[PDB]
Amino acid sequence: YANQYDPSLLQPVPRSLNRNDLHLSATLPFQGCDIWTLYELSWLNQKGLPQVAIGEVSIPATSANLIESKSFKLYLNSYNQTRFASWDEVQTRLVHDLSACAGETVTVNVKSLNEYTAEPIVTMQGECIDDQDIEIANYEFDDALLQGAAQGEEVSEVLHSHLLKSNQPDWGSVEIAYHGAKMNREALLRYLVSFREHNEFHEQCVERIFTDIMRYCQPQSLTVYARYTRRGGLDINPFRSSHQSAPNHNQRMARQ
Amino acid sequence: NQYDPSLLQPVPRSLNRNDLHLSATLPFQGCDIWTLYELSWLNQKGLPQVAIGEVSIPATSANLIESKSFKLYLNSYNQTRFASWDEVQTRLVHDLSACAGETVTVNVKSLNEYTAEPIVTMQGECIDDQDIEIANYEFDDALLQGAAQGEEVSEVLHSHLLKSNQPDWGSVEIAYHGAKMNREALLRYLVSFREHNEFHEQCVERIFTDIMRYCQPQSLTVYARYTRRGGLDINPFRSSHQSAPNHNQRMARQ
Amino acid sequence: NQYDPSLLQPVPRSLNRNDLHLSATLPFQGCDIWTLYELSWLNQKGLPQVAIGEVSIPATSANLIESKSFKLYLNSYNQTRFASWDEVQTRLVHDLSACAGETVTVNVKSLNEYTAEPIVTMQGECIDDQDIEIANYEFDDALLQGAAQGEEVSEVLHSHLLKSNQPDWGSVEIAYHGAKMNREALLRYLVSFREHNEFHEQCVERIFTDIMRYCQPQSLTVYARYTRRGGLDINPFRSSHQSAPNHNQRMARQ
Amino acid sequence: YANQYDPSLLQPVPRSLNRNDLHLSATLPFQGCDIWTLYELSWLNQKGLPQVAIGEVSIPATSANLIESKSFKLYLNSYNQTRFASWDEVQTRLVHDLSACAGETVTVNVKSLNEYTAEPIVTMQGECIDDQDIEIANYEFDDALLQGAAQGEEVSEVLHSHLLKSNPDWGSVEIAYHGAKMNREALLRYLVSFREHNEFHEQCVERIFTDIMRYCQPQSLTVYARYTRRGGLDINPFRSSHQSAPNHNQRMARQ
Ligand SMILES: Nc1nc2[nH]cnc2c(=O)[nH]1
Ligand SMILES: Nc1nc2[nH]cnc2c(=O)[nH]1
Ligand SMILES: Nc1nc2[nH]cnc2c(=O)[nH]1
Ligand SMILES: Nc1nc2[nH]cnc2c(=O)[nH]1
Ligand SMILES: [Mg+2]
Ligand SMILES: [Mg+2]
């Protein structure tokens, strides 16, 4: 007997636990959300016939807790052999359980597979910074790579990179939109690549990138948004901004 | 932490084929199409490169490649400098062909080859929307007994409800020429895999050979597309007459 | 009449590309996919063989192959004994590569490879169902002026209303990432080809370059599938980033 | 200016003209129909926007006339720049004009392209006879190849071949019969002997039917051929001693 519905499998992690290392002020310097895509969501209807869907979850960055991804997979797996009366019931339980875990109302949209037919694979906004003629040999984390990286003229720009890797490896693309002194692209790319051997949660990586850019580069406004490939059937896409609340859509990128 | 072909582990196709009562003379042709979503290495100067790999392994190869070993092998690229993308392709073809036992094709695609690519569904009629009760989940090939008693047709059917055992998940497309299949029988048969344990490639061959022995179509193609595990997916294709699928685009859950 | 490669007539791609104001370094990559519905020859013992040929000619080739000459060339096979299907596939690759000026890929498929293959449509949203009036039929690329003023999107659009000139007929799929396109403008633009004269390959390159210069998408793919003439069809694919379509399946009118 | 709707482009050909050469009885020894597929049907709606469809036409084998294929193509092309108020109108005109040409009511379906999505490519019923270990060097027509071809035990069977060529035109042919079992080598050599031979598809099917009836004398017989299109149109003649039509007009691999 596979284990059936079990909300106790969900594991909260307080966001303050990692934010402590970032030495943040009393107020959070960002707002935003963690958007998750649940590619494996499946359960049984009343009559025992399997149902399959994709879930799209948004957890506020102000929630007391994030949800540990493994535990989230195990919790979703507990639906697989459980009978539910309706799709509405499934969506309601996901909101209830994930909101209890996070400590703040979590948004959930349970979508049938046909909602995805002809949907696009997308890239990120702005210019890709990856095509550089530089040598890298040190992959150890080094925030000081951002020392003096913003010395250009005042600009609004959006940059992105597909070279984010952190630690089993996690793989992501990251979009950085800002208004401030123009950022040195070589410094930025070396800084991003220095995560390659570093071990932090995706949500934390994004908050670290945001806070390092804010402290070294002092833009007037900033958004950092990363989209990671799935682990265990789930992906996370942390969005952190000085002024925006969320990305426009949750459209997948090429490796997602 | 460096490139290491010894990480690849073959599994002989003969194990399950003997279990299906097959001759070494196969009743199908085809291939296993793999998508490698996490392919990454370093260029000549140490700057990371990322790509998606598209691999086709002939169904006649002695071995399939065990997926986790495939993951670990690919990870061994991550901190290795390679002279060019052509070098990477070359190594992949060499190593994967040696492991499978027959020449494997490999296409290493840059990520921008996927911009504005659409998600696809499968062809023909989805059979999943049936108001039926499933009273148990044991595998039962005899669900197909007498399932093909209709008039001679050529049609294509699909289901998104394939699962085996962590769970794996797939959609499957069945194109045939023969006596028309009972859609309820077919759906019950597919659902009965849920608590079955075998590899994706093996499941597809089981589906193919069961439909053959119970339904006796003149022509049959079975093509399944499974969600990834460990950053790679497998899409086994088995056909009476066709060597490869004429499309390879990702589905909603992939 | 025996096998005769001198029947093939090349047409240089440069003629129309110069007319489109293209540099020798192209703004697209891609290929022309041909389907040879009437391929037939004699085996060693004089017994007729029939097959469907699938040919891909790189868009970088110096020449395209003129369709009527391609038909005449294929007809020269009809009363010629060839030792095996591999011999036929070899001759085709050799002759078509020499004519195009670059290696052409050829698959010679038996007819039973198509049994129970489904007809396909194109992906994304069809733009044809518009309640608009067309007041004249002259080609006008300026119909695209200001046509891309929407928000940044990635989407796929298609139309079945492509016609050029005896008339030719096609459907066209346009996938792009850029400012959202006005569908009325796009449909008018495509309808304005109706009484225009150029080759399919040239039409597609004109569509690509007109969209690129009026709409300025970040990336663009244009893939047209035309109905056959003389037993063969042409399906030109042109893309910023992709080298080939990830499907090759016939549509309703093909 | 493209030439607009012109029903005078259609060219009738009396069926009796070719049937002469087959020396038939007073009454026809067969019934059936010619099913045509019109893959490039297109016209303009009342606002000038192009419309595209696939037509499916059935002409009774009893019609006084068949329709010459090139003329049929030219007639359909005359729709391309012509405005019509509705699809129903287009269907109505096609029935009227094609029926007047043929001399007997013709059925016409005008189908939107989406009615073809996921439709199958099909093969023919029964056994393919093409995989034989025989040498052929003479491609001249020879009906005498069927002399004594049906000696076997009494059987019902269906046979098909993809090797029909005549003038090049390309087809597959399905032969269902009840009678003394037919020699497959003789049948295939006979079909291959059309390879350098000039006759209309409808006539080829009638010649095959009448040659098999005379040399093999089955109790019942159907001959159905499906040819690849010429000029955007295909023709699929069906002739039978006891059946009226095939079940569907589904395309084969080369069609
Ligand atoms: N939420 C969350 N859970 C994890 N468990 C392992 N890695 C992660 C991560 O990056 N984010
Ligand atoms: N090739 C292969 N390897 C596996 N390892 C675990 N499951 C699978 C599978 O389905 N296929
Ligand atoms: N290659 C080619 N040859 C032709 N001959 C006449 N039209 C065409 C065409 O569109 N393409
Ligand atoms: N109806 C008809 N017309 C033709 N015109 C040229 N060939 C043919 C044919 O086989 N049938
Ligand atoms: Mg995603
Ligand atoms: Mg047809």
PDB file of C-alpha atoms in Angstrom, chain A residues 2 39-45 47-54 73-74 77 80-81 83 113-114 116-123 130-137 139 162-163 165 169 171 173 189 193 196 229-233 252-256, chain B residues 37-38 40-43 45-52 75 77-79 81 111-112 114-121 128-137 160-161 163 166-167 169 171 187 191 194-195 227-231 250-254:
ATOM      1  CA  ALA A   2       1.417   3.312  -1.162  1.00  0.00           C
ATOM      2  CA  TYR A  39       4.609  18.986 -13.196  1.00  0.00           C
ATOM      3  CA  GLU A  40       3.651  15.646 -11.602  1.00  0.00           C
ATOM      4  CA  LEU A  41       0.328  16.363  -9.825  1.00  0.00           C
ATOM      5  CA  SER A  42      -1.952  13.359 -10.011  1.00  0.00           C
ATOM      6  CA  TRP A  43      -4.601  11.721  -7.895  1.00  0.00           C
ATOM      7  CA  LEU A  44      -7.676   9.432  -8.252  1.00  0.00           C
ATOM      8  CA  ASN A  45     -11.236  10.555  -8.853  1.00  0.00           C
ATOM      9  CA  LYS A  47     -14.363   6.152  -8.979  1.00  0.00           C
ATOM     10  CA  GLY A  48     -10.638   5.398  -8.841  1.00  0.00           C
ATOM     11  CA  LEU A  49      -9.698   6.722 -12.276  1.00  0.00           C
ATOM     12  CA  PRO A  50      -6.393   8.633 -12.305  1.00  0.00           C
ATOM     13  CA  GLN A  51      -6.440  12.390 -12.958  1.00  0.00           C
ATOM     14  CA  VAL A  52      -3.367  14.393 -14.024  1.00  0.00           C
ATOM     15  CA  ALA A  53      -2.704  18.117 -13.901  1.00  0.00           C
ATOM     16  CA  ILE A  54       0.005  20.737 -13.623  1.00  0.00           C
ATOM     17  CA  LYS A  73       7.452  16.214  -3.641  1.00  0.00           C
ATOM     18  CA  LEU A  74       6.616  13.602  -0.989  1.00  0.00           C
ATOM     19  CA  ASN A  77       3.162  11.903  -4.155  1.00  0.00           C
ATOM     20  CA  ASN A  80      -1.328   9.775  -6.249  1.00  0.00           C
ATOM     21  CA  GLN A  81      -3.341   6.852  -4.823  1.00  0.00           C
ATOM     22  CA  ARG A  83      -9.432   9.390  -4.143  1.00  0.00           C
ATOM     23  CA  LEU A 113      -2.871  19.291 -19.393  1.00  0.00           C
ATOM     24  CA  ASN A 114      -4.755  20.663 -22.385  1.00  0.00           C
ATOM     25  CA  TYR A 116      -0.614  23.816 -22.029  1.00  0.00           C
ATOM     26  CA  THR A 117      -1.055  22.783 -25.642  1.00  0.00           C
ATOM     27  CA  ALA A 118       0.740  25.322 -27.850  1.00  0.00           C
ATOM     28  CA  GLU A 119       2.077  27.270 -24.857  1.00  0.00           C
ATOM     29  CA  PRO A 120       5.575  28.597 -25.497  1.00  0.00           C
ATOM     30  CA  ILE A 121       8.966  27.879 -24.243  1.00  0.00           C
ATOM     31  CA  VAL A 122      10.381  31.329 -23.416  1.00  0.00           C
ATOM     32  CA  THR A 123      13.651  33.032 -22.748  1.00  0.00           C
ATOM     33  CA  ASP A 130      26.936  34.840 -21.345  1.00  0.00           C
ATOM     34  CA  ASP A 131      28.844  35.333 -24.569  1.00  0.00           C
ATOM     35  CA  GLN A 132      32.042  36.724 -23.166  1.00  0.00           C
ATOM     36  CA  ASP A 133      35.672  36.152 -24.052  1.00  0.00           C
ATOM     37  CA  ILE A 134      36.916  35.699 -20.497  1.00  0.00           C
ATOM     38  CA  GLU A 135      38.780  32.987 -18.613  1.00  0.00           C
ATOM     39  CA  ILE A 136      37.366  31.519 -15.440  1.00  0.00           C
ATOM     40  CA  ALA A 137      39.296  29.093 -13.242  1.00  0.00           C
ATOM     41  CA  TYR A 139      34.542  28.643  -9.054  1.00  0.00           C
ATOM     42  CA  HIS A 162      21.669  30.956 -18.292  1.00  0.00           C
ATOM     43  CA  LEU A 163      24.830  30.028 -16.336  1.00  0.00           C
ATOM     44  CA  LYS A 165      24.458  26.617 -11.058  1.00  0.00           C
ATOM     45  CA  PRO A 169      23.772  20.328  -8.994  1.00  0.00           C
ATOM     46  CA  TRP A 171      20.606  24.682 -12.742  1.00  0.00           C
ATOM     47  CA  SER A 173      18.667  31.172 -15.532  1.00  0.00           C
ATOM     48  CA  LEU A 189      29.088  37.024 -14.907  1.00  0.00           C
ATOM     49  CA  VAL A 193      29.576  31.675 -11.928  1.00  0.00           C
ATOM     50  CA  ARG A 196      28.914  26.951  -9.167  1.00  0.00           C
ATOM     51  CA  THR A 229      15.109  23.360 -13.551  1.00  0.00           C
ATOM     52  CA  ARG A 230      12.899  20.910 -11.642  1.00  0.00           C
ATOM     53  CA  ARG A 231      14.135  18.473  -9.019  1.00  0.00           C
ATOM     54  CA  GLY A 232      11.775  15.669  -8.181  1.00  0.00           C
ATOM     55  CA  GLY A 233       9.045  16.912 -10.521  1.00  0.00           C
ATOM     56  CA  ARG A 252       8.777  27.643 -18.761  1.00  0.00           C
ATOM     57  CA  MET A 253      12.260  28.147 -20.102  1.00  0.00           C
ATOM     58  CA  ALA A 254      14.147  25.742 -22.385  1.00  0.00           C
ATOM     59  CA  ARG A 255      15.696  23.499 -19.676  1.00  0.00           C
ATOM     60  CA  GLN A 256      12.630  23.619 -17.395  1.00  0.00           C
TER      61      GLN A 256
ATOM     62  CA  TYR B  37      17.878  18.936 -20.246  1.00  0.00           C
ATOM     63  CA  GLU B  38      20.930  19.601 -18.037  1.00  0.00           C
ATOM     64  CA  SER B  40      26.686  21.535 -19.239  1.00  0.00           C
ATOM     65  CA  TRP B  41      30.454  21.722 -19.526  1.00  0.00           C
ATOM     66  CA  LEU B  42      33.215  24.355 -19.625  1.00  0.00           C
ATOM     67  CA  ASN B  43      34.644  25.911 -22.793  1.00  0.00           C
ATOM     68  CA  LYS B  45      38.772  28.990 -21.171  1.00  0.00           C
ATOM     69  CA  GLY B  46      36.551  27.679 -18.316  1.00  0.00           C
ATOM     70  CA  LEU B  47      33.308  29.565 -19.058  1.00  0.00           C
ATOM     71  CA  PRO B  48      30.262  27.329 -18.548  1.00  0.00           C
ATOM     72  CA  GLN B  49      28.271  26.224 -21.580  1.00  0.00           C
ATOM     73  CA  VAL B  50      24.697  24.872 -21.414  1.00  0.00           C
ATOM     74  CA  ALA B  51      22.752  22.917 -24.024  1.00  0.00           C
ATOM     75  CA  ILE B  52      19.965  20.417 -24.470  1.00  0.00           C
ATOM     76  CA  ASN B  75      27.516  15.535 -14.452  1.00  0.00           C
ATOM     77  CA  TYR B  77      31.157  17.019 -17.920  1.00  0.00           C
ATOM     78  CA  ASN B  78      30.276  19.939 -15.703  1.00  0.00           C
ATOM     79  CA  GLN B  79      33.787  20.967 -14.581  1.00  0.00           C
ATOM     80  CA  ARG B  81      36.910  22.044 -20.321  1.00  0.00           C
ATOM     81  CA  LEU B 111      19.047  26.853 -25.610  1.00  0.00           C
ATOM     82  CA  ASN B 112      17.890  29.487 -28.095  1.00  0.00           C
ATOM     83  CA  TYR B 114      13.834  26.283 -28.102  1.00  0.00           C
ATOM     84  CA  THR B 115      12.691  29.878 -27.865  1.00  0.00           C
ATOM     85  CA  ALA B 116       8.980  30.053 -28.864  1.00  0.00           C
ATOM     86  CA  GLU B 117       8.815  26.293 -29.391  1.00  0.00           C
ATOM     87  CA  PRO B 118       5.322  25.166 -28.537  1.00  0.00           C
ATOM     88  CA  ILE B 119       4.250  22.430 -26.169  1.00  0.00           C
ATOM     89  CA  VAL B 120       2.486  19.631 -28.012  1.00  0.00           C
ATOM     90  CA  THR B 121      -0.084  16.989 -27.191  1.00  0.00           C
ATOM     91  CA  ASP B 128      -8.994   9.146 -20.782  1.00  0.00           C
ATOM     92  CA  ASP B 129     -12.418  10.759 -20.422  1.00  0.00           C
ATOM     93  CA  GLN B 130     -14.428   7.701 -19.459  1.00  0.00           C
ATOM     94  CA  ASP B 131     -16.968   7.413 -16.645  1.00  0.00           C
ATOM     95  CA  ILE B 132     -15.604   4.121 -15.352  1.00  0.00           C
ATOM     96  CA  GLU B 133     -14.744   2.643 -11.941  1.00  0.00           C
ATOM     97  CA  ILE B 134     -11.360   1.101 -11.214  1.00  0.00           C
ATOM     98  CA  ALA B 135     -11.753  -1.465  -8.382  1.00  0.00           C
ATOM     99  CA  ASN B 136      -8.143  -2.538  -8.136  1.00  0.00           C
ATOM    100  CA  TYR B 137      -4.714  -1.615  -9.444  1.00  0.00           C
ATOM    101  CA  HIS B 160      -1.940  10.631 -20.401  1.00  0.00           C
ATOM    102  CA  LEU B 161      -2.551   8.092 -17.613  1.00  0.00           C
ATOM    103  CA  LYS B 163       2.368   5.472 -14.590  1.00  0.00           C
ATOM    104  CA  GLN B 166       9.426   6.746  -7.067  1.00  0.00           C
ATOM    105  CA  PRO B 167       6.563   6.943  -9.535  1.00  0.00           C
ATOM    106  CA  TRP B 169       4.692   9.341 -15.454  1.00  0.00           C
ATOM    107  CA  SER B 171       1.614   9.723 -22.054  1.00  0.00           C
ATOM    108  CA  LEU B 187      -7.706   2.410 -20.766  1.00  0.00           C
ATOM    109  CA  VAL B 191      -4.146   2.043 -15.801  1.00  0.00           C
ATOM    110  CA  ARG B 194       0.274   1.915 -12.040  1.00  0.00           C
ATOM    111  CA  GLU B 195       1.898  -0.330  -9.426  1.00  0.00           C
ATOM    112  CA  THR B 227       8.545  12.899 -17.625  1.00  0.00           C
ATOM    113  CA  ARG B 228      12.185  13.360 -16.694  1.00  0.00           C
ATOM    114  CA  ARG B 229      13.996  11.872 -13.757  1.00  0.00           C
ATOM    115  CA  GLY B 230      17.355  13.311 -12.836  1.00  0.00           C
ATOM    116  CA  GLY B 231      17.197  15.873 -15.626  1.00  0.00           C
ATOM    117  CA  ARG B 250       7.962  18.051 -25.542  1.00  0.00           C
ATOM    118  CA  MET B 251       4.595  17.491 -23.905  1.00  0.00           C
ATOM    119  CA  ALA B 252       2.990  19.437 -21.024  1.00  0.00           C
ATOM    120  CA  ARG B 253       4.475  17.475 -18.162  1.00  0.00           C
ATOM    121  CA  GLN B 254       7.913  16.943 -19.758  1.00  0.00           C
TER     122      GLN B 254
END
